[PDB]
Short mmCIF file of C-alpha atoms in Angstrom, two decimals:
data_model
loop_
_atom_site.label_atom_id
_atom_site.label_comp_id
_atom_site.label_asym_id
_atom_site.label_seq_id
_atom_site.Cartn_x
_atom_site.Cartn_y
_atom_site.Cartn_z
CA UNK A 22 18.99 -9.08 -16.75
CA UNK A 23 20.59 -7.01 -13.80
CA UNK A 24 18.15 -5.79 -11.16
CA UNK A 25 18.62 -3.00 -8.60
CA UNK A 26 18.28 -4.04 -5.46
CA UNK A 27 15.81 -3.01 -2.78
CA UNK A 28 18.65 -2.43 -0.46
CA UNK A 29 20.52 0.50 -2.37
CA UNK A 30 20.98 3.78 -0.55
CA UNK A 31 21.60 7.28 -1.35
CA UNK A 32 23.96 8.32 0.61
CA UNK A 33 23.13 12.25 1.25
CA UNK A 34 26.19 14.32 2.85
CA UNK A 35 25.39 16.71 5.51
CA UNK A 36 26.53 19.72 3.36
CA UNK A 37 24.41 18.25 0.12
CA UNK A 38 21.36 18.37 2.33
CA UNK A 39 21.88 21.69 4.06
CA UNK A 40 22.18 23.11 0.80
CA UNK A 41 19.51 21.43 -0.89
CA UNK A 42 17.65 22.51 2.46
CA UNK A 43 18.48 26.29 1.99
CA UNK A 44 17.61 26.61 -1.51
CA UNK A 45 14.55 24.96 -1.26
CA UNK A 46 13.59 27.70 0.93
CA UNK A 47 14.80 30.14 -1.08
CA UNK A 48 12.86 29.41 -4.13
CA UNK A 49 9.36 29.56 -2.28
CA UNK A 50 6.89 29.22 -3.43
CA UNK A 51 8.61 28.86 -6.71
CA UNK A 52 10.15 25.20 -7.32
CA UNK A 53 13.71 25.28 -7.74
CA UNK A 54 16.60 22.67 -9.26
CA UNK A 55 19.99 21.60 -8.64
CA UNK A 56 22.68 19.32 -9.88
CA UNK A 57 23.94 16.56 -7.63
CA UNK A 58 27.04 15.73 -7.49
CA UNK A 59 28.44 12.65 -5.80
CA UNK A 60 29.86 9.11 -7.01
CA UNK A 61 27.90 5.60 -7.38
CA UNK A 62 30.20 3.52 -5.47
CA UNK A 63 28.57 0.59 -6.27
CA UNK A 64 25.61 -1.28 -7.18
CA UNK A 65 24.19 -0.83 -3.59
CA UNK A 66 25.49 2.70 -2.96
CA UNK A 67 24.81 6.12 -4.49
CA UNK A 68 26.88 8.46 -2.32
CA UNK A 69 25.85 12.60 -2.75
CA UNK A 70 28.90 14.09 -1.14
CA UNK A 71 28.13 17.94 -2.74
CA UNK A 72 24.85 19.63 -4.71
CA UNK A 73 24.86 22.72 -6.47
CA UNK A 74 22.14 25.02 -6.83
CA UNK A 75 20.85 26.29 -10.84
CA UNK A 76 19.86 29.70 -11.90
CA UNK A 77 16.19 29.88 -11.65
CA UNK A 78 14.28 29.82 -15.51
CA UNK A 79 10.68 30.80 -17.12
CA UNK A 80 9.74 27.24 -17.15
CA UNK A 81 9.79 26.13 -13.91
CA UNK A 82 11.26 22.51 -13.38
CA UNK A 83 12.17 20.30 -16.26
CA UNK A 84 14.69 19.48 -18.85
CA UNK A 85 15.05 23.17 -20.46
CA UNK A 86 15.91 24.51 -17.05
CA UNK A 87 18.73 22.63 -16.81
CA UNK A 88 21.01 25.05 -19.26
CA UNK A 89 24.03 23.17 -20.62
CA UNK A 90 26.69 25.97 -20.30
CA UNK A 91 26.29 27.23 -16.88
CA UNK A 92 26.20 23.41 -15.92
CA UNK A 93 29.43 22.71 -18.17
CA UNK A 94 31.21 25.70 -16.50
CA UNK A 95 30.20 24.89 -13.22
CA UNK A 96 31.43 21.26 -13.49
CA UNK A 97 34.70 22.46 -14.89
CA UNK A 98 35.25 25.40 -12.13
CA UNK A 99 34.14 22.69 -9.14
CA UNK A 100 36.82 20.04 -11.07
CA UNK A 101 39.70 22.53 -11.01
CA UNK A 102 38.25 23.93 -6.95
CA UNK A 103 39.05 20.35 -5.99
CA UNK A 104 35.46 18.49 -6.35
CA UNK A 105 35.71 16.41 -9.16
CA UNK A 106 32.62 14.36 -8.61
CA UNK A 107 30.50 13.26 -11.64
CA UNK A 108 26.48 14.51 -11.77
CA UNK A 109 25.01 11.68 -9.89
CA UNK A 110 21.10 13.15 -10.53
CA UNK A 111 18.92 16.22 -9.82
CA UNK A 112 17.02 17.76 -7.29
CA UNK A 113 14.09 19.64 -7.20
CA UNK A 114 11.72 21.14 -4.32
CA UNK A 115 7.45 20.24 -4.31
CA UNK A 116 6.99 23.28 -1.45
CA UNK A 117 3.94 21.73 0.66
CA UNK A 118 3.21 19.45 -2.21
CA UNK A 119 4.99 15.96 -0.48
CA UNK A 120 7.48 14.10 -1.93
CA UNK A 121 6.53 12.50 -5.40
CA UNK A 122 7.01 12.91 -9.33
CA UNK A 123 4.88 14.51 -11.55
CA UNK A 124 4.80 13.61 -15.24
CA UNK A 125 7.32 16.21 -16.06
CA UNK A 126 9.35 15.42 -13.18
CA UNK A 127 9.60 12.18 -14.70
CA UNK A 128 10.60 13.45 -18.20
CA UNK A 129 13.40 14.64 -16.75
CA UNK A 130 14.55 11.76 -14.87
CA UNK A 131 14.17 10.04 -18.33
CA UNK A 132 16.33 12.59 -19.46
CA UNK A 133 18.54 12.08 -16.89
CA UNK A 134 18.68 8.15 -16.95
CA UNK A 135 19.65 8.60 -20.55
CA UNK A 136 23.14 9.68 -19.19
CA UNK A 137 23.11 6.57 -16.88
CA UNK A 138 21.78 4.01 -15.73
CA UNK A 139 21.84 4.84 -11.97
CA UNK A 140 20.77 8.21 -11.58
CA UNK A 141 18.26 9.39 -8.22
CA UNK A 142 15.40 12.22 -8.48
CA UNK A 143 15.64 12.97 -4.83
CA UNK A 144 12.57 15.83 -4.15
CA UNK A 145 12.56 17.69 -0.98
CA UNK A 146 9.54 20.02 0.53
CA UNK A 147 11.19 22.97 1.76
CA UNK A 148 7.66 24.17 4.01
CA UNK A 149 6.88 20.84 5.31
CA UNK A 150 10.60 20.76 6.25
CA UNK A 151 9.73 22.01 9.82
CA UNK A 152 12.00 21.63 12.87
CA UNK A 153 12.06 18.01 13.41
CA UNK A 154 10.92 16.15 10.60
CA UNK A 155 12.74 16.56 7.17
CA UNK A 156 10.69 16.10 4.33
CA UNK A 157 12.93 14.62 1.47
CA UNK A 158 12.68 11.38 -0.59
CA UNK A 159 14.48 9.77 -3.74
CA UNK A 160 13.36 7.92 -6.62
CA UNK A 161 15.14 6.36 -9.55
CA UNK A 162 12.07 4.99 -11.84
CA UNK A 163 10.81 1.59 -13.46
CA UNK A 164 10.86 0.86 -16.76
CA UNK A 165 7.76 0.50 -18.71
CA UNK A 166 8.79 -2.65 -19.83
CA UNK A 167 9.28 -4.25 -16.35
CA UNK A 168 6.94 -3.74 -14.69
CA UNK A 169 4.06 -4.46 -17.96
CA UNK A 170 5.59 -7.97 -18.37
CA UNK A 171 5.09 -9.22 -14.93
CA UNK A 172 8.61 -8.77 -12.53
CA UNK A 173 8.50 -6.87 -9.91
CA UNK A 174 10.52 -3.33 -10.11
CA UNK A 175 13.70 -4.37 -8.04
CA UNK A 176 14.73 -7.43 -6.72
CA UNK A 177 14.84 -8.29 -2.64
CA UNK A 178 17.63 -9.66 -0.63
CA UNK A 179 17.37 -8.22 2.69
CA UNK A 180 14.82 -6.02 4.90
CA UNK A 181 16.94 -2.70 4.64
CA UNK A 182 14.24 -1.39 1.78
CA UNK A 183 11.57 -2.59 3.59
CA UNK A 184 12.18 -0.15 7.39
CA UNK A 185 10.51 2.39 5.76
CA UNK A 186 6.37 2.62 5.00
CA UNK A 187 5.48 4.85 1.29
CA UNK A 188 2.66 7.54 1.62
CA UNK A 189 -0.44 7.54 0.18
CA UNK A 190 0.26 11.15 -0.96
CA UNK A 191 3.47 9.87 -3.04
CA UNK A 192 1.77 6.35 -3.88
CA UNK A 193 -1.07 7.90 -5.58
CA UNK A 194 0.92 10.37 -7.87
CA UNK A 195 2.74 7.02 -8.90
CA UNK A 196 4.93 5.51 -6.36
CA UNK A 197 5.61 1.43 -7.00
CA UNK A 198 3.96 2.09 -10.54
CA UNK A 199 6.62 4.45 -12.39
CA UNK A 200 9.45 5.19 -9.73
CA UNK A 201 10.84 3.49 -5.86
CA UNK A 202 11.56 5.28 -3.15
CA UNK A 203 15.14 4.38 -2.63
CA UNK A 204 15.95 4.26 1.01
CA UNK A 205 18.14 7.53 2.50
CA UNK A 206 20.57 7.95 4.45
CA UNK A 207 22.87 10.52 5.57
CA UNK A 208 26.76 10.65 5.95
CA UNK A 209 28.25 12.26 8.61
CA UNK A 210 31.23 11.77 10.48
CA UNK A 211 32.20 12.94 13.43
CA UNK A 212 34.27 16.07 12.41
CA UNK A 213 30.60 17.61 11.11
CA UNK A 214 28.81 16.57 14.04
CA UNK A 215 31.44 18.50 16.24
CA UNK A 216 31.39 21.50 14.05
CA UNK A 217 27.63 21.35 13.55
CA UNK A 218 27.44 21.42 17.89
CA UNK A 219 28.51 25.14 17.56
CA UNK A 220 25.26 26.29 16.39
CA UNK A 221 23.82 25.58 19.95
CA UNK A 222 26.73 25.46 22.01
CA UNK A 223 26.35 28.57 24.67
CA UNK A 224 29.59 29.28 25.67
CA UNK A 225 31.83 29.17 28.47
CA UNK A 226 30.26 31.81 30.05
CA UNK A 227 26.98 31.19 30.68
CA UNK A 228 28.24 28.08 32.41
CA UNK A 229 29.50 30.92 35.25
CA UNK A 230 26.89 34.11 34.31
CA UNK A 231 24.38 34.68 36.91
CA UNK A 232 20.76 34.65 36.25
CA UNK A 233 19.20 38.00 37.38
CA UNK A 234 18.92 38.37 40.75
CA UNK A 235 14.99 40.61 40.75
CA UNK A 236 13.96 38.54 38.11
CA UNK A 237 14.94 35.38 39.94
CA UNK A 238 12.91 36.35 42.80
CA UNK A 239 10.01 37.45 40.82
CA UNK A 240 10.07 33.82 39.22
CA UNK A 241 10.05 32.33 42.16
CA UNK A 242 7.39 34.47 44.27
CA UNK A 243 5.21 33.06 40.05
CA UNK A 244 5.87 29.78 40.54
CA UNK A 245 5.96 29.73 44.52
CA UNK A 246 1.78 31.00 44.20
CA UNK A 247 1.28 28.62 41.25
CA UNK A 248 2.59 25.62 43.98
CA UNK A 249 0.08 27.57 46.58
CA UNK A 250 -3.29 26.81 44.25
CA UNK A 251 -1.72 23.39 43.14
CA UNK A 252 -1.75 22.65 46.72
CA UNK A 253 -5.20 23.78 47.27
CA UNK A 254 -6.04 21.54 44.52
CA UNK A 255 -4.45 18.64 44.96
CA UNK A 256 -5.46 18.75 48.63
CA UNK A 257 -9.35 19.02 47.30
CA UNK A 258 -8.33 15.91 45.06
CA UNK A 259 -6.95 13.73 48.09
CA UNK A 260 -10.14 14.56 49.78
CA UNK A 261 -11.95 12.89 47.54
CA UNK A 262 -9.49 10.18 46.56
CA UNK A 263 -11.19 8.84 50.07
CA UNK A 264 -14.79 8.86 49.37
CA UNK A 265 -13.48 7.18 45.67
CA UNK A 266 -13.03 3.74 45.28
CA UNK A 267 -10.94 2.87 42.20
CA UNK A 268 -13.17 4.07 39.13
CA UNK A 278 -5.05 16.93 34.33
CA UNK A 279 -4.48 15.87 37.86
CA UNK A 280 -2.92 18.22 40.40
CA UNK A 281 -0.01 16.13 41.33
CA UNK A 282 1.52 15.72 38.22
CA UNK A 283 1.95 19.35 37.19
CA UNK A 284 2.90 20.12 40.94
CA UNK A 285 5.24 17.40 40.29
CA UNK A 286 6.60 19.82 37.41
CA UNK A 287 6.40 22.81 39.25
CA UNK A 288 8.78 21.53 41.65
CA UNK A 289 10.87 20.34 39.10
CA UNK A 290 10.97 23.60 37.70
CA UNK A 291 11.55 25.37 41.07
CA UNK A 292 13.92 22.39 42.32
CA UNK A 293 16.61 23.24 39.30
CA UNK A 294 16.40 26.92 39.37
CA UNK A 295 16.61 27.65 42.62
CA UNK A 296 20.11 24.83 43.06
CA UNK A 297 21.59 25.73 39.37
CA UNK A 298 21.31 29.32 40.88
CA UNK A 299 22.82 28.61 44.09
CA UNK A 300 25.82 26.59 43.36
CA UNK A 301 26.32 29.17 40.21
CA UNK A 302 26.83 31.76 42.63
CA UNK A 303 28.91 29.49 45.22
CA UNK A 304 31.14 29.19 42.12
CA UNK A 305 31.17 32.71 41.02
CA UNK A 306 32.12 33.94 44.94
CA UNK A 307 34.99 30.61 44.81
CA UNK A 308 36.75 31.21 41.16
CA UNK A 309 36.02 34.96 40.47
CA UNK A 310 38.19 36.02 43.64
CA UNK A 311 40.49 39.39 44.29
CA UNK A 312 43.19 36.66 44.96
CA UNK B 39 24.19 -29.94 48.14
CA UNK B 40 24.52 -27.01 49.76
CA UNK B 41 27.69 -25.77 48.01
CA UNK B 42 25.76 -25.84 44.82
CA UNK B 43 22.72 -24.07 46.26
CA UNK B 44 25.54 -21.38 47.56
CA UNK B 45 27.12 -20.99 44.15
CA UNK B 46 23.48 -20.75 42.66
CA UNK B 47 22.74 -18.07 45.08
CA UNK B 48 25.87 -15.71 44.66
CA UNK B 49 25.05 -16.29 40.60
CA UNK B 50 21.73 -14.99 41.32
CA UNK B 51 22.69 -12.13 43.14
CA UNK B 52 25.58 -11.36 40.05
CA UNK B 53 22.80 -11.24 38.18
CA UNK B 54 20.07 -9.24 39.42
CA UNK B 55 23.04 -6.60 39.93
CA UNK B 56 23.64 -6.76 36.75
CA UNK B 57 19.77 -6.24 35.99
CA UNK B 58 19.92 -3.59 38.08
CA UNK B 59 22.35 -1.68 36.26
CA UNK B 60 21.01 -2.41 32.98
CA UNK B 61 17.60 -0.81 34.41
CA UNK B 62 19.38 2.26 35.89
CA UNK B 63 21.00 3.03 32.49
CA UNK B 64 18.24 2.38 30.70
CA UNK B 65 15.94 4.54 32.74
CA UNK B 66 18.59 7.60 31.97
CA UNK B 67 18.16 7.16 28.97
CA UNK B 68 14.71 7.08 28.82
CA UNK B 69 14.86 10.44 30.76
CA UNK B 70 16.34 11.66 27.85
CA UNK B 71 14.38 9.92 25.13
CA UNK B 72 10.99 11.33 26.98
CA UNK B 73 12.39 14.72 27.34
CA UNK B 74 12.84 14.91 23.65
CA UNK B 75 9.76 13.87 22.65
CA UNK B 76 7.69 16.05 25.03
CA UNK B 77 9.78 18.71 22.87
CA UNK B 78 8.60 17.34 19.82
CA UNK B 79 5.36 17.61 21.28
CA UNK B 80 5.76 21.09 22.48
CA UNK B 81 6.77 21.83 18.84
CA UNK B 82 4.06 20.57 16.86
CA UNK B 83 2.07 23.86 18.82
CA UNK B 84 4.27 25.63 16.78
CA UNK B 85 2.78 29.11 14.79
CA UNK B 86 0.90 29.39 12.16
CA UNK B 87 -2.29 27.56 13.03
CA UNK B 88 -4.99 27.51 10.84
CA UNK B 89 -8.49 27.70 13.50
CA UNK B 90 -11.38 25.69 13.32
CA UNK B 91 -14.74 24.84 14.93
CA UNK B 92 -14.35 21.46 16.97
CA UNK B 93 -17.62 20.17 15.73
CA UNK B 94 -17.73 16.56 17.47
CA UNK B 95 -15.87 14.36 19.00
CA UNK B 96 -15.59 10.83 17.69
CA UNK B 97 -13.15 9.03 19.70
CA UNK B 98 -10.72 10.07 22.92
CA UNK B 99 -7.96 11.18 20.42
CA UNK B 100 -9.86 11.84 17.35
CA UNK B 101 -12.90 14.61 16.21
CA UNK B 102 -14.36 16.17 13.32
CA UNK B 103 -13.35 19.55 13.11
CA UNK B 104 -14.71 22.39 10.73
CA UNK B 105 -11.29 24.32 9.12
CA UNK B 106 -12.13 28.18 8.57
CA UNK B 107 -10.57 27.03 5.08
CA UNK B 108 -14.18 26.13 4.26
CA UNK B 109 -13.55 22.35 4.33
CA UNK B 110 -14.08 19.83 7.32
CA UNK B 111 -11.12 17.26 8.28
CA UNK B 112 -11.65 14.18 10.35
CA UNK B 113 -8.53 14.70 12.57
CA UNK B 114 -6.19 13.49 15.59
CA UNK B 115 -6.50 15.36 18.94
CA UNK B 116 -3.19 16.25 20.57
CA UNK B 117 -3.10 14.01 23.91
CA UNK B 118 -2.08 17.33 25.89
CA UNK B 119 -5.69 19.11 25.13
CA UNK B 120 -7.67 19.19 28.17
CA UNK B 121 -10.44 17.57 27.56
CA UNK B 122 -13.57 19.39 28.85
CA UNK B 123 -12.95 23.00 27.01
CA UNK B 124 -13.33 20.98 23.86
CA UNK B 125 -16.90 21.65 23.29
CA UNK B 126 -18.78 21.81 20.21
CA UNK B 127 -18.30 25.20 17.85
CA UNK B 128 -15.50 25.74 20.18
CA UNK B 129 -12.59 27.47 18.33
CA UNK B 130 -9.74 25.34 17.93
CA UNK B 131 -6.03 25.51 16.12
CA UNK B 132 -5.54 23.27 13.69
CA UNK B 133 -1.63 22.16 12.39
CA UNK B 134 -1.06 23.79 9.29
CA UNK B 135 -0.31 21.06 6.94
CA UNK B 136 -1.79 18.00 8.81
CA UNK B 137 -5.04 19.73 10.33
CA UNK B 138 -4.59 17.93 13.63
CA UNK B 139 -6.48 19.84 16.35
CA UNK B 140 -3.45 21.03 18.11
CA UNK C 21 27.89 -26.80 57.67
CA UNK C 22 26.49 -24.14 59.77
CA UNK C 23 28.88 -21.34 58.07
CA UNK C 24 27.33 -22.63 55.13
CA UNK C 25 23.63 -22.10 56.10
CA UNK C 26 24.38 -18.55 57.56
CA UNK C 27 26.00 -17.64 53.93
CA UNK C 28 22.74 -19.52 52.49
CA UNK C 29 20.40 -17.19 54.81
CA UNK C 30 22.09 -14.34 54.22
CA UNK C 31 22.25 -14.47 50.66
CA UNK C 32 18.66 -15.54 49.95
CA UNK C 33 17.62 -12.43 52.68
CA UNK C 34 19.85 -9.94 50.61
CA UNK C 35 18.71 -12.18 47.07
CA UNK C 36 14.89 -11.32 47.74
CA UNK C 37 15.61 -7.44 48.57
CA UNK C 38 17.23 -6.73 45.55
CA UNK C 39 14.90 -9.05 43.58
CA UNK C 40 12.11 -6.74 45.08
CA UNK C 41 14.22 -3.54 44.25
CA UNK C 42 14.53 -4.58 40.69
CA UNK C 43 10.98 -5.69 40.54
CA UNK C 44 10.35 -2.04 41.39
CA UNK C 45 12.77 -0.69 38.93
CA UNK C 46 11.00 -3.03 36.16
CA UNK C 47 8.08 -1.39 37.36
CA UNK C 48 9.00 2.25 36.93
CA UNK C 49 10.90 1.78 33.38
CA UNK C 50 8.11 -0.04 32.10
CA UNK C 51 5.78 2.96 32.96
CA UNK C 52 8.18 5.72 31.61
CA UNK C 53 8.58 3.25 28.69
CA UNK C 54 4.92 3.02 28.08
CA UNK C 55 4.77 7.20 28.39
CA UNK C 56 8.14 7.30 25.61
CA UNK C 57 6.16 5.02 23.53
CA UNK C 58 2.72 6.51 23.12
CA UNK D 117 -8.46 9.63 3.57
CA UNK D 118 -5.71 11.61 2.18
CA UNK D 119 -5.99 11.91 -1.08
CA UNK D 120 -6.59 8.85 -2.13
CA UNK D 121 -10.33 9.05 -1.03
CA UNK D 122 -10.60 5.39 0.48
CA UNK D 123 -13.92 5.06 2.72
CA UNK D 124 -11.64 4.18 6.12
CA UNK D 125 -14.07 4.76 8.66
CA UNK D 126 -17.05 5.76 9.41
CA UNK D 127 -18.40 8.32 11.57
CA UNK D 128 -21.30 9.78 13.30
CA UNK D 129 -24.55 11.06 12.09
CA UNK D 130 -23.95 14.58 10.39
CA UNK D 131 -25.44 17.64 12.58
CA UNK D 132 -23.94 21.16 12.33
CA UNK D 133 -22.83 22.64 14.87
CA UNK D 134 -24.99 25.75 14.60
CA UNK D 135 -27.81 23.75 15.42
CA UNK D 136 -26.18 20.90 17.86
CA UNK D 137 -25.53 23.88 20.51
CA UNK D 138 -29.25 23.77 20.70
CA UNK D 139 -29.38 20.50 22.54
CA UNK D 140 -29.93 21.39 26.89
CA UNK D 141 -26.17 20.28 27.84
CA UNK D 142 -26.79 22.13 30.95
CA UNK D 143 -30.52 21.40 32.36
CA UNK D 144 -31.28 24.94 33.53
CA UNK D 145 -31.92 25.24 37.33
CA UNK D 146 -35.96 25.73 37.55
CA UNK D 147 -38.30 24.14 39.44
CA UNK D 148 -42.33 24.51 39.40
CA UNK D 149 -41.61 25.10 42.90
CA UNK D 150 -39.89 28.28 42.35
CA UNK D 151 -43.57 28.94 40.13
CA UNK D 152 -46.54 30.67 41.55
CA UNK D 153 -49.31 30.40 40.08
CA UNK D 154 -49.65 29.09 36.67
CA UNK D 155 -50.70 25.56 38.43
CA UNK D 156 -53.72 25.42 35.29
CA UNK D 157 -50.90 26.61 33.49
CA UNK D 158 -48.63 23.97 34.28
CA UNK D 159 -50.97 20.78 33.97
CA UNK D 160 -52.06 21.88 30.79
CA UNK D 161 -48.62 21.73 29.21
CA UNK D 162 -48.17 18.46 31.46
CA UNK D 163 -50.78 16.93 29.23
CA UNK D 164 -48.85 17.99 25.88
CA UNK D 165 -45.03 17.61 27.19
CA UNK D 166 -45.42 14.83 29.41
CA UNK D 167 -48.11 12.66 29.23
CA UNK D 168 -48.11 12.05 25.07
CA UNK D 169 -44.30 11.04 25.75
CA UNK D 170 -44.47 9.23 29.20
CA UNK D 171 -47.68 7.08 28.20
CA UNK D 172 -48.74 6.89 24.84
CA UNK D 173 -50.77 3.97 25.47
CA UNK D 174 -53.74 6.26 26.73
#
C-alpha cells in the first residue's frame, strides 16, 4: 500500500497566502473558510497557486458552510477568467487559537478527502499572525486504520519533514494521532518579490529631500546632551574599572549614540552637498 | 628545500587572504543579520501588552509573573530589561499571546 | 640562495601579520556571531 | 507547561508578593548611636531580639 511521504510540501503562492492572510483578518473574531485552489503535481508536491474566500454562514466552519452553488459558480467563472485550477483543499482561520484541528475541522477534511486522496487542511491564525512570524500550518490526516494496526502515518526518505519541531498546542488537540503537519513552503519568483519591494520602496526623492534644518539641530543639541551624561558616566565607570580587578554599561549605548549622531549628521551633509551640486540654476 | 618552503609560504599567504575575505563578507553580513534581529527584538515591545506584577525572579532570563488576567505564568524575561527596576510587585508588560515579561 | 632567504623572511614577516589580522577578525565575527545567535 | 500540563520544572517556594515586600531589602539607616536615652530600653529588647537568637544555648 502507497504511503505519503514525509517529504511532501504544500507549495503556498504568495497571492494564496496574502489572501488567506487578509481574510483571516477580516473574519475576526469569527472563523472564516475558503476554497483552495492549486494542482498536486505530484506525489511529493501540492502546489496552491490561488485561494478564494466563501460567504460567511450561521454555522461557523464545517461541511454545511461550504454551499455547493456559489462554489460551482465560482469554479466555473475562475475557469472561463483564466484559472482553471482544480480545489486542492480548504482553509480555515483558529484566531489566537494556534494551528490545529478540532473534531469538526476534521469532519470536514473527511469530507474533503472523500473527493481525493491528497487534499491539505492548511489553518492559519490571523491575530497571532503579527509582523514577523506567520502563523499558518497544514495537515492532511491519518487513517484510523493505519495508525491502529501498527505503521507509522507516512513513510521517511529524507530529513526535509523532519526541519521543522510540532507544538505542544497542536500536538495535544491531535497532531501525529489523527493528522501531520505537512511541511510549507512558499513560491515566489522573482517578478513578486520585485513588485512586492514597492510597498516599502521610498522613492526617488527622499534619496535627494533634505531633512529639516531646526529640527536637525534640535536632534542634535538631544542627542549631543545625551553623549554629555554618557560621558559623565562612562568616565565614573573607567574610574572604577581601576580599583576593579576582573570580577547596561555606558560605552555601549555611547557607542550607539555616536552611531546615531555619526549617520545623521554625514547622510545630512553629503545630502545637501548633492542638493547644492545637481539642483543648480545651470 | 627552500624552494618548497617558498612555495609553502606564498600558499599560505593565498590562503589567509582568502580567509580574510571570507571573514570580511561574512562580518557584513552579520551586520545585517544582527540588525534584523535587534528589529525583531524591538518588535516583540510591540502594543497591546497585557501588565503584570513581577512577583520573583527564578533565573537571569526567566520569573514568575502575576498577569492582571487573574492567572500567574512562569515566563521568559526579554534580555533588554534592565535588570535592577525588576523588583517584586513591580508592574510589568507582559506579550499578549506568549506572556513573556517584555 | 640569499634572494631566496630574503623572499623566505619577508614572506613569513608579512605571513604572521596577516595571520594575526585574521586571528583578530576570527575574533570579532565570532563575538558578533555569538550576539546574532543568542 | 502549555497546555499540556507536564510538571517541567520546578520553582521556588510560593510567597505573595503582598507580603514578600515586607522583607528589609533596604536595612534602614539607624543606629543606637543616633538614640538618647532609652539605654534600659535598648538592653531589654537586646535580651528578646538578640540574645534568644545569637545564643540559645543559655
Amino acid at each position: 500500500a502507497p504511503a505519503v511521504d514525509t517529504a511532501e510540501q504544500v507549495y503556498i503562492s504568495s497571492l494564496a497566502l496574502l489572501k488567506m492572510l487578509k481574510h483571516g483578518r477580516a473574519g475576526v473574531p469569527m472563523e472564516v473558510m475558503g476554497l483552495m485552489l492549486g494542482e498536486f503535481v505530484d506525489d511529493y508536491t501540492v502546489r496552491v497557486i490561488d485561494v478564494f474566500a466563501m460567504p460567511q454562514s450561521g454555522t461557523g466552519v464545517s461541511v454545511e458552510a461550504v454551499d455547493p452553488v456559489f462554489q460551482a459558480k465560482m469554479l466555473d467563472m475562475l475557469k472561463q477568467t483564466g484559472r482553471p485550477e482544480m480545489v486542492v483543499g480548504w482553509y480555515h482561520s483558529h484566531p489566537g487559537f494556534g494551528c490545529w484541528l478540532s473534531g469538526v475541522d476534521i469532519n470536514t477534511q473527511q469530507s474533503f478527502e472523500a473527493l481525493s486522496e491528497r487534499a491539505v487542511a492548511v489553518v492559519v491564525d490571523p491575530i497571532q499572525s503579527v509582523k514577523g512570524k506567520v502563523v499558518i500550518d497544514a495537515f492532511r490526516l491519518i487513517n484510523a486504520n493505519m495508525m491502529v494496526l501498527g505503521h507509522e502515518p507516512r513513510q521517511t526518505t529524507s530529513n526535509l519533514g523532519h526541519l521543522n519541531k510540532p507544538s505542544i498546542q497542536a500536538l495535544i488537540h491531535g497532531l501525529n494521532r489523527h493528522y501531520y503537519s505537512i511541511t510549507i513552503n512558499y513560491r515566489k519568483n522573482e517578478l513578486e518579490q520585485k513588485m512586492l519591494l514597492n510597498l516599502h520602496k521610498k522613492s526617488w526623492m527622499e534619496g535627494l529631500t533634505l531633512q529639516d534644518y531646526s529640527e536637525h539641530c534640535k536632534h542634535n543639541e538631544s542627542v549631543v546632551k545625551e553623549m554629555l551624561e554618557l560621558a559623565k558616566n562612562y568616565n565614573k565607570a573607567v574610574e572604577e574599572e581601576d580599583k576593579m580587578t576582573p570580577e547596561q554599561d555606558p560605552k555601549r549605548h555611547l557607542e550607539e549614540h555616536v552611531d546615531v549622531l555619526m549617520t545623521s549628521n554625514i547622510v545630512q551633509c553629503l545630502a545637501a552637498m548633492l542638493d547644492t551640486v545637481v539642483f543648480k540654476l545651470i | 628545500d627552500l624552494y618548497s618552503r617558498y612555495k609553502k609560504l606564498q600558499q599560505e599567504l593565498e590562503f589567509l587572504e582568502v580567509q580574510e575575505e571570507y571573514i570580511k563578507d561574512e562580518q557584513k553580513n552579520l551586520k545585517k543579520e544582527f540588525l534584523h534581529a535587534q528589529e525583531e527584538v524591538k518588535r516583540i515591545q510591540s502594543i497591546p501588552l497585557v501588565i503584570g506584577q513581577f512577583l520573583e525572579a527564578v533565573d537571569q532570563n526567566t520569573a514568575i509573573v502575576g498577569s492582571t488576567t487573574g492567572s500567574n505564568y512562569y515566563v521568559r524575561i526579554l534580555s533588554t530589561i534592565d535588570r535592577e527596576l525588576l523588583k517584586p510587585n513591580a508592574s510589568v508588560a507582559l506579550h499578549k499571546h506568549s506572556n513573556a515579561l517584555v | 640562495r640569499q634572494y631566496y632567504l630574503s623572499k623566505i623572511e619577508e614572506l613569513q614577516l608579512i605571513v604572521n601579520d596577516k595571520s594575526q589580522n585574521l586571528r583578530r577578525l576570527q575574533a570579532q565575527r565570532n563575538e558578533l556571531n555569538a550576539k546574532v545567535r543568542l | 507547561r502549555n497546555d499540556s500540563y507536564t510538571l517541567h520544572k520546578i520553582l521556588p517556594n510560593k510567597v505573595d508578593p503582598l507580603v514578600s515586600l515586607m522583607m528589609v531589602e533596604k536595612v534602614p539607616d539607624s543606629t543606637y548611636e543616633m538614640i538618647g536615652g532609652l539605654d534600659k530600653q535598648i538592653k531589654e529588647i537586646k535580651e528578646v531580639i538578640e540574645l534568644p537568637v545569637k545564643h540559645p544555648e543559655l
